[PDB]
Design an enzyme around this catalytic site. Sequence first.
Site, short mmCIF file in Angstrom:
data_model
loop_
_atom_site.label_atom_id
_atom_site.label_comp_id
_atom_site.label_asym_id
_atom_site.label_seq_id
_atom_site.Cartn_x
_atom_site.Cartn_y
_atom_site.Cartn_z
CG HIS A 1 -26.06 79.52 24.22
ND1 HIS A 1 -25.37 78.63 25.01
CD2 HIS A 1 -27.29 78.98 24.03
CE1 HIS A 1 -26.14 77.59 25.29
NE2 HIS A 1 -27.31 77.78 24.70
CB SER B 1 -32.53 86.92 26.05
OG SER B 1 -32.31 86.86 24.65
CE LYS C 1 -43.62 87.39 23.42
NZ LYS C 1 -42.16 87.72 23.61
CG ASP C 2 -39.42 83.55 18.42
OD1 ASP C 2 -39.90 84.10 19.43
OD2 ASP C 2 -38.24 83.16 18.35
CD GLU D 1 -31.45 101.78 -2.28
OE1 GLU D 1 -31.30 102.64 -3.19
OE2 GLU D 1 -32.49 101.10 -2.15
C1 HEM Z 1 -27.46 89.18 11.23
C2 HEM Z 1 -27.99 90.07 12.07
C3 HEM Z 1 -28.46 89.68 13.50
C4 HEM Z 1 -28.94 88.50 13.93
C5 HEM Z 1 -29.23 87.21 13.12
C6 HEM Z 1 -29.19 88.64 15.36
C7 HEM Z 1 -29.67 87.66 16.16
C8 HEM Z 1 -30.04 87.87 17.45
C9 HEM Z 1 -30.91 87.01 18.20
C10 HEM Z 1 -31.55 85.71 17.66
C11 HEM Z 1 -31.03 87.51 19.42
C12 HEM Z 1 -31.92 86.81 20.45
C13 HEM Z 1 -33.32 87.38 20.25
C14 HEM Z 1 -33.19 88.81 20.62
O1 HEM Z 1 -32.68 89.06 21.76
O2 HEM Z 1 -33.55 89.66 19.76
C15 HEM Z 1 -30.25 88.74 19.50
C16 HEM Z 1 -30.10 89.63 20.54
C17 HEM Z 1 -29.11 90.62 20.65
N1 HEM Z 1 -28.41 91.21 19.60
FE1 HEM Z 1 -28.57 90.43 17.72
N2 HEM Z 1 -28.83 89.90 15.77
C18 HEM Z 1 -28.37 90.56 14.65
C19 HEM Z 1 -27.93 91.85 14.64
C20 HEM Z 1 -27.42 92.50 15.75
C21 HEM Z 1 -26.74 93.75 15.68
C22 HEM Z 1 -26.57 94.45 14.32
C23 HEM Z 1 -26.40 94.08 16.94
C24 HEM Z 1 -25.63 95.32 17.46
C25 HEM Z 1 -25.04 96.23 16.67
C26 HEM Z 1 -26.84 93.00 17.83
C27 HEM Z 1 -26.67 92.89 19.20
C28 HEM Z 1 -27.48 92.14 20.04
C29 HEM Z 1 -27.53 92.17 21.48
C30 HEM Z 1 -26.70 93.03 22.43
C31 HEM Z 1 -28.60 91.17 21.88
C32 HEM Z 1 -29.05 90.83 23.30
C33 HEM Z 1 -30.46 91.42 23.40
C34 HEM Z 1 -31.09 91.10 24.73
O3 HEM Z 1 -30.39 91.12 25.78
O4 HEM Z 1 -32.31 90.78 24.74
N3 HEM Z 1 -27.47 92.05 17.06
N4 HEM Z 1 -29.67 88.93 18.27
C1 LIG Z 2 -31.77 84.00 23.85
O1 LIG Z 2 -33.04 84.17 23.19
C2 LIG Z 2 -33.42 83.64 21.95
C3 LIG Z 2 -32.61 82.72 21.23
O2 LIG Z 2 -31.49 82.26 21.58
C4 LIG Z 2 -33.04 82.23 20.02
C5 LIG Z 2 -32.09 81.26 19.35
C6 LIG Z 2 -34.28 82.63 19.48
C7 LIG Z 2 -34.68 82.04 18.12
C8 LIG Z 2 -33.78 82.70 17.10
C9 LIG Z 2 -33.14 82.01 16.16
C10 LIG Z 2 -33.35 80.54 16.07
C11 LIG Z 2 -32.26 82.79 15.20
C12 LIG Z 2 -31.26 81.88 14.54
C13 LIG Z 2 -30.68 82.53 13.31
C14 LIG Z 2 -30.05 81.74 12.41
C15 LIG Z 2 -29.91 80.26 12.61
C16 LIG Z 2 -29.46 82.35 11.17
C17 LIG Z 2 -28.44 81.43 10.52
C18 LIG Z 2 -28.75 81.33 9.05
C19 LIG Z 2 -27.78 80.89 8.24
C20 LIG Z 2 -26.46 80.57 8.86
C21 LIG Z 2 -28.00 80.74 6.74
C22 LIG Z 2 -27.29 79.56 6.08
C23 LIG Z 2 -28.24 79.12 5.00
C24 LIG Z 2 -28.03 78.15 4.08
C25 LIG Z 2 -26.75 77.32 3.99
C26 LIG Z 2 -29.16 77.90 3.11
C27 LIG Z 2 -28.59 77.89 1.71
C28 LIG Z 2 -28.97 76.61 1.00
C29 LIG Z 2 -29.47 76.68 -0.24
C30 LIG Z 2 -29.63 78.03 -0.89
C31 LIG Z 2 -29.87 75.43 -0.98
C32 LIG Z 2 -30.71 75.79 -2.22
C33 LIG Z 2 -29.92 75.48 -3.47
C34 LIG Z 2 -30.38 74.60 -4.37
C35 LIG Z 2 -29.57 74.32 -5.60
C36 LIG Z 2 -31.68 73.88 -4.18
C37 LIG Z 2 -35.09 83.55 20.21
O3 LIG Z 2 -36.21 83.98 19.84
C38 LIG Z 2 -34.67 84.03 21.43
O4 LIG Z 2 -35.55 84.93 22.04
C39 LIG Z 2 -36.27 84.64 23.24
O1 LIG Z 3 -22.92 109.64 -3.42
C1 LIG Z 3 -23.47 108.60 -2.99
C2 LIG Z 3 -23.21 108.23 -1.69
O2 LIG Z 3 -22.37 109.00 -0.93
C3 LIG Z 3 -23.83 107.10 -1.18
C4 LIG Z 3 -23.47 106.79 0.23
C5 LIG Z 3 -24.56 106.10 1.05
C6 LIG Z 3 -23.99 105.58 2.35
C7 LIG Z 3 -22.76 104.72 2.06
C8 LIG Z 3 -22.26 104.07 3.28
C9 LIG Z 3 -21.06 103.37 3.16
C10 LIG Z 3 -20.53 102.73 4.27
C11 LIG Z 3 -21.22 102.82 5.48
CL1 LIG Z 3 -20.52 101.99 6.90
C12 LIG Z 3 -22.42 103.52 5.59
C13 LIG Z 3 -22.95 104.16 4.47
C14 LIG Z 3 -21.68 105.63 1.51
C15 LIG Z 3 -22.15 106.03 0.14
C16 LIG Z 3 -24.68 106.32 -1.98
O3 LIG Z 3 -25.26 105.26 -1.59
C17 LIG Z 3 -24.92 106.72 -3.29
C18 LIG Z 3 -25.76 105.97 -4.09
C19 LIG Z 3 -26.00 106.35 -5.40
C20 LIG Z 3 -25.41 107.48 -5.94
C21 LIG Z 3 -24.56 108.22 -5.13
C22 LIG Z 3 -24.31 107.85 -3.80
#
Ligand code: HEM
Ligand SMILES: COc1c(O)c(C)c(C/C=C(\C)CC/C=C(\C)CC/C=C(\C)CC/C=C(\C)CC/C=C(\C)CCC=C(C)C)c(O)c1OC
Ligand SMILES: O=C1C(O)=C([C@H]2CC[C@H](c3ccc(Cl)cc3)CC2)C(=O)c2ccccc21
Lengths: 126, 248, 93, 62, 385, 385, 57
Positions: free
Chosen positions: F202, F206, F228-229, F272
């Site tokens: 934030h 981006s 768009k999204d 997987e």
């Molecule tokens: C729970 C998983 C994730 C969520 C909810 C998430 C969410 C987001 C969102 C909403 C944005 C803004 C839209 C976009 O730029 O794509 C973003 C950008 C970005 N994400 Fe994530 N992301 C996730 C995973 C990751 C991971 C796994 C990495 C790195 C290992 C990462 C690094 C970045 C970076 C560096 C940006 C900036 C991209 C740009 O400059 O356009 N994110 N992410």
């Molecule tokens: C800078 O650029 C951006 C940018 O900032 C954003 C925000 C977006 C839009 C992206 C988003 C809005 C992503 C936001 C992601 C999240 C908010 C993920 C967070 C989700 C959670 C924290 C999950 C929490 C969920 C719960 C608590 C739901 C659980 C409730 C339940 C299960 C109730 C049901 C149970 C019963 C008994 C009924 C963009 O596209 C983008 O690109 C231009």
């Molecule tokens: O022997 C394995 C094995 O080695 C993995 C692997 C896959 C990748 C896992 C993993 C763990 C941590 C990270 Cl950060 C990345 C990958 C490590 C275990 C499996 O998922 C698996 C599933 C079912 C039967 C056997 C196996």
Amino acid sequence: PQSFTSIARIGDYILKSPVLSKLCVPVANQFINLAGYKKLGLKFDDLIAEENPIMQTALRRLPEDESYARAYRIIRAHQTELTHHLLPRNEWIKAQEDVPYLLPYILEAEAAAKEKDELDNIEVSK
Amino acid sequence: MTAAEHGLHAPAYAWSHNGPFETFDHASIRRGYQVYREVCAACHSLDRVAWRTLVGVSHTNEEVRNMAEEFEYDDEPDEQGNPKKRPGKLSDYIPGPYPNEQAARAANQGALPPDLSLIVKARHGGCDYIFSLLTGYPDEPPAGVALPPGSNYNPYFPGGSIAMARVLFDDMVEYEDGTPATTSQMAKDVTTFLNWCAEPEHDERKRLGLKTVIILSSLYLLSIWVKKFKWAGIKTRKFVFNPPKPRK
Amino acid sequence: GPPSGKTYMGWWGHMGGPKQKGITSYAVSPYAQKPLQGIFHNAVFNSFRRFKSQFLYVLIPAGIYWYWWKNGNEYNEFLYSKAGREELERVNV
Amino acid sequence: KSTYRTPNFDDVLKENNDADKGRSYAYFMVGAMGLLSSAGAKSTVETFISSMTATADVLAMA
Amino acid sequence: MAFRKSNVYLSLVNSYIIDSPQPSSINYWWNMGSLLGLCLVIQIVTGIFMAMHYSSNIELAFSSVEHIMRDVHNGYILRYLHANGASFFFMVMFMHMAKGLYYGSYRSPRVTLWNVGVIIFILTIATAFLGYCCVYGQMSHWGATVITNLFSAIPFVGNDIVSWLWGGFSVSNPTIQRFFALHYLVPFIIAAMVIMHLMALHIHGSSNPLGITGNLDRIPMHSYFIFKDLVTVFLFMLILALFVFYSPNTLGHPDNYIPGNPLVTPASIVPEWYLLPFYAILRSIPDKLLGVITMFAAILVLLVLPFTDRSVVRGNTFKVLSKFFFFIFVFNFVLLGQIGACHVEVPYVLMGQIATFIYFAYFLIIVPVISTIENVLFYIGRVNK
Amino acid sequence: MAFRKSNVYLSLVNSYIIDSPQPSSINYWWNMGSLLGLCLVIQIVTGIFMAMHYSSNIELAFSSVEHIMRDVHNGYILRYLHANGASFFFMVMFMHMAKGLYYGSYRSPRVTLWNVGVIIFILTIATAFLGYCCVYGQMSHWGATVITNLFSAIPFVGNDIVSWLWGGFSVSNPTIQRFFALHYLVPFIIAAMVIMHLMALHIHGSSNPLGITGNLDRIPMHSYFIFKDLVTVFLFMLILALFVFYSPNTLGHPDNYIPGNPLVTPASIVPEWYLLPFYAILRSIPDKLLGVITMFAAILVLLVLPFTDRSVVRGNTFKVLSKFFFFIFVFNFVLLGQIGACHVEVPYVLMGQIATFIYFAYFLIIVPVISTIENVLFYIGRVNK
Amino acid sequence: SFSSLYKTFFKRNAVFVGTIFAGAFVFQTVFDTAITSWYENHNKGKLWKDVKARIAA
Ligand code: HEM
Ligand SMILES: COc1c(O)c(C)c(C/C=C(\C)CC/C=C(\C)CC/C=C(\C)CC/C=C(\C)CC/C=C(\C)CCC=C(C)C)c(O)c1OC
Ligand SMILES: O=C1C(O)=C([C@H]2CC[C@H](c3ccc(Cl)cc3)CC2)C(=O)c2ccccc21
Ligand code: HEM
Ligand code: HEM
Ligand code: HEM
Ligand code: HEM
Ligand SMILES: COc1c(O)c(C)c(C/C=C(\C)CC/C=C(\C)CC/C=C(\C)CC/C=C(\C)CC/C=C(\C)CCC=C(C)C)c(O)c1OC
Ligand SMILES: CCCCCCCCCCCO[C@@H]1O[C@H](CO)[C@@H](O[C@H]2O[C@H](CO)[C@@H](O)[C@H](O)[C@H]2O)[C@H](O)[C@H]1O
Ligand SMILES: O=C1C(O)=C([C@H]2CC[C@H](c3ccc(Cl)cc3)CC2)C(=O)c2ccccc21
């Protein structure tokens, strides 16, 4: 938010009626004692809650050296309050002091507001 | 509420373990198990207690291995696919008298004898109320109280009509150590044993409790001190007012 | 950072309050004082003042409530006693 | 009055026996709290972890 | 600038826990939210650690908790802490809510602050109830029957809602299993909500035991209150230690070491203490629909408090007539609780009824009355004419 | 000012979703984080709703999921969505991480932004693994054995850690039960973490498919990108619908409809897909301790990327030599994955080994080299002398 | 706590994070020493150890 303009109405009435005034004021006097507050250097107009526009029209308006006065008391209050004590008996605000220094402006401003409220919804008969 | 529906309040006997520093009387527990084994086992399950759990508390390793194997638990089928028994292990839970809820009631005019493992907590008063219901079967159901067929009177039960007949009758148990096998000594023990059964952690629990408090108390007092120190400047802080010449 | 909504608090140097002039504060290092600043002695003459100034405001209401408690309590033990079963058959239905 | 005119802490301040007892008492205070806290924090953790060692009803070395 | 101020993460940390400007004058009452956050953390840690050995199947349920008791290492400490802690949570939370009435925290600009805590309080009752239904003793299975049944009170659809909500004919197995799952979910909702609660708190900052403006004599939460809060903390743990190791059930109902049984309700239905005053209010009403409504209303009514307080000052501190009834209110509320423990016998029912009246009348009637009077005492009790 | 700006709650909502100033030029690649948040929400909803009928006891475990399949209403939809969704989560997350490499998002001021996503990615693998161990089929019980066993690689204490972590002799019952409980916990940790991730995002906003400054032509997320999204969203659901109703296991291993058995590992150990490329890297190392290390290092190495990128511009967009290897990297990574599926046969092992080299060499070697060259092409490719 | 006996070890600085942890480590054995003793004594005769003593089988 019971209005000061409204406390005026009621409390003026009671003050005027020699009937009422003799009944009420003894108690009221007894009350503004049991409060404890003049023992923390506090005048009553200090106590009035401020987080609302009228009081902020009413403190912006309050004469300078008067606000410096308020201030010292309010800090003296807190300070003492935190020391879990009461002031040196002769530092207490004395019964003649507890004067409504603020109340004109509060009233001045309340008035002004109720007026604008009215003048925003003033209707028309043709 | 009529004092009859409530049941009479059991009194504050003075137990070995009452108090913040008091381990059970393990010798006492040892007796209760016999008083348990010979008397009440006839009707009462003690299912959430395991043979091993006795070891080191009321008995010794074999002493409990002995008891254990006097019963045949179910055991994995032979190569053919047909059942088999086997003696017990220390890994086991002391078996109930009955094979199900029904035979428990069949054998008791349709009463369901409570599993005892948790009894000293599943009742108000508990240790006392257990003792008192056991040494409180008086001779006759008080003048006017008309008792149903197969039900006894107890002031300590609610509404006296208890489906459990009296069972402590001096000496019916041969106290192995050699103590007065009375009824108020047969009873005081099964209580102390049944106490354990519902609260095994007990002696450690006050042990650790001890430590927790001594440390925690000290922290409290220590914390306080610290506080007045860090506050010392604010507490003894002192202001003064000097109105200023009107020019701004 | 977009606009923020006005309140009645700010941070240091813009805390929100009125414009202080005249007061002059003085304090002394927490090192530079008696460990046990003022304990017992005359610091306890207040553990009876911090009491007095208020106790009535609790006791009086606690009183009203605890006697009202005891009363119907007694009254209940009665109508569920032998001596009471009479009044019961009447009050209760 | 003048602003230099310095109020009375003679009640609060200690007599000049030592300008170092109000430091030494404090550090053994803060320090023995530090000690015990840790010592407790240690045990608190030890407790939840050992919550995971094999339950009392498994070790069937059979 | 300094790093803790500059960093994206540490700046929050600083601005809510280190550099926050607090009124200089606030006392140990204010240590409650701190101690509130501490319970929520004790709830969540010990809960998860216990869940690792819990089974939510209606058979294994009651036993598995005994398992946690008899078998899991330190498992008894896990349980007695979870349970006793839930209570202390509720005490501390009442004292926290008390403090808010007495010093009139509920009062603008802090309305939303206040309102949200009413949501939290609701979610904490919802949470702790489910956690109870998960032991599956006696009090559990019947607790869970009645709360599920509060929904029948809903016109028409009400029974079905209950059937749904049950997943079958009775509080059965699909019930304890959802009650476990919902018990997991919700505490994160409280925490979610504690964050908005702390956000509201943040933009106005705390009030004071003087109900005047803080902005003239602020000091920073570090290191005063951080250290101040540490005193209430240890003290909190001490009493909690006391219960947990020495009085583990001096707060629970023995009917709950009995395995739940769907055919046989006990005959001593005392519910949890922190719940009692509501049980009382519920019972006080000889009508089903109305009774339910009035129980819920007993909590909602808490939302009018900023309107009905007619005063011109925040705080019972300088308020004799206000203090007085404020402690009638406290003491009523406790009595109401005593009423909850006793049988629906006489005069108890009629006593119950009167307290209930006193209860709502305090928000709705006493307060706006008294406070309006108290405005007028403040005027005539000084001025000339 | 407007209310949505003024309110304590709606101001966040506005400033992160309505009034946020985005670069005018960003394309559908950027729709990934949005679609990322959507999966996390699909994971958490369907998970909880399923947990209501799940039992984590090693007996009932495998069956209870069949229960959710055969019995619970729409329960099969609950499962196929949870499972297929976890995959799409992982695809989308790779594409999200891809995008970050290609346009060099990982690059200052966005390091922390980047770093945190590496933590998220770690927590998502941890999460999904546990959720797998909860089916308790074959792949589950043996998956859970190996991951628990990665800890033996730790000097000395390593075996004990594993024993602890197992709660007994084998991946037994105290295991699947903690794996269920930890499966509940962790997704809230991801969400916790997604928040700091979005906070970093934030304060810098981006980047763009041009790797120049945004601050000259911003437009507000509402209503462009919100709309768009929404395009990527529906499209996402469509393919997910496709799998869920028509190809529910075209992504899972049939060995998992077999009840786990602790005496008999299968002979087709494909893990997987989103995991495969690591399985490959792991296997590639004929040493236990080193092999483990190198598997973890396969993810950590991702943290050097902002130092080894030596360039003077963010983005492969104007970068031919950079584009080229960037797709060798992508394509290696996929091959590495193919290697994971095949047996430790020849030449596969040796192919595996070479890819693994190519893998780390890309961060550690190719990139800083190429990018330094590419700086110098940019100089001499214009100027006079 | 006496200004001499303290200042000896620590001169004019607090305890240091590691010295704390050290003391903690030591205290924790020294304590569980004492308290477990005082408790096994306070309950003399009552412990299964004392009862294992007399009782023979
Ligand atoms: C729970 C998983 C994730 C969520 C909810 C998430 C969410 C987001 C969102 C909403 C944005 C803004 C839209 C976009 O730029 O794509 C973003 C950008 C970005 N994400 Fe994530 N992301 C996730 C995973 C990751 C991971 C796994 C990495 C790195 C290992 C990462 C690094 C970045 C970076 C560096 C940006 C900036 C991209 C740009 O400059 O356009 N994110 N992410
Ligand atoms: C800078 O650029 C951006 C940018 O900032 C954003 C925000 C977006 C839009 C992206 C988003 C809005 C992503 C936001 C992601 C999240 C908010 C993920 C967070 C989700 C959670 C924290 C999950 C929490 C969920 C719960 C608590 C739901 C659980 C409730 C339940 C299960 C109730 C049901 C149970 C019963 C008994 C009924 C963009 O596209 C983008 O690109 C231009
Ligand atoms: O022997 C394995 C094995 O080695 C993995 C692997 C896959 C990748 C896992 C993993 C763990 C941590 C990270 Cl950060 C990345 C990958 C490590 C275990 C499996 O998922 C698996 C599933 C079912 C039967 C056997 C196996
Ligand atoms: C140490 C010896 C024994 C003890 C301490 C004991 C204890 C108890 C207790 C605590 C109850 C629970 C009633 C209540 O508190 O609500 C009970 C009921 C009962 N007991 Fe026993 N018992 C013993 C021996 C026996 C024996 C020897 C028999 C029959 C051979 C027996 C048959 C029953 C039956 C049928 C009930 C059901 C009563 C009811 O439902 O009210 N018990 N016993
Ligand atoms: C999860 C439960 C709760 C937590 C963690 C919590 C946290 C806090 C904290 C940390 C504070 C600052 C310290 C203090 O002023 O006590 C505070 C104050 C406050 N709380 Fe809560 N609280 C909780 C429950 C409640 C409830 C249930 C209500 C109302 C129904 C409420 C309403 C308020 C209000 C109005 C203040 C401002 C008090 C003042 O001006 O000093 N809170 N809370
Ligand atoms: C606001 C937080 C919480 C409250 C107020 C709460 C309340 C309760 C209560 C009153 C009980 C019954 C305790 C008893 O009498 O034995 C209980 C049980 C239980 N709770 Fe919680 N709970 C909370 C959070 C959690 C969390 C985060 C978990 C995580 C798994 C959890 C897991 C359990 C389990 C497994 C039981 C059954 C074992 C036991 O009863 O001690 N709880 N809860
Ligand atoms: C980041 C979020 C999540 C991920 C990546 C994830 C991953 C997984 C995976 C891969 C499986 C095995 C699916 C299968 O092949 O059948 C699974 C199963 C399961 N998950 Fe999750 N999970 C997540 C969140 C949740 C949440 C919040 C819950 C709440 C209870 C939950 C409850 C379950 C249950 C009960 C199962 C067993 C039934 C089934 O396998 O479909 N999951 N999870
Ligand atoms: C305005 O005035 C204030 C004021 O603002 C503040 C902040 C304080 C201080 C108060 C606080 C700091 C209270 C803050 C409360 C919270 C932060 C509560 C929030 C707690 C949570 C959100 C709980 C979340 C917990 C977890 C995620 C822990 C769970 C992790 C687990 C269980 C891992 C263990 C699992 C395994 C497998 C090991 C005051 O005293 C004060 O008065 C003057
Ligand atoms: C949540 C679990 C918590 C576990 C328990 C925590 C234990 C905390 C122990 C921390 C000890 O941290 C210790 O603090 C003292 C202040 O008292 C520091 O002392 C520092 O400031 C003091 C003044 O106060 C100076 O005398 C000294 O020259 C300086 O090093 C010291 O650098 C550090 O060694
Ligand atoms: O009959 C009840 C009953 O009525 C409650 C009551 C307690 C207060 C509950 C309550 C629910 C919601 C709120 Cl916002 C407040 C209180 C409602 C159920 C119980 O807790 C209970 C427990 C065990 C057996 C029976 C019962």
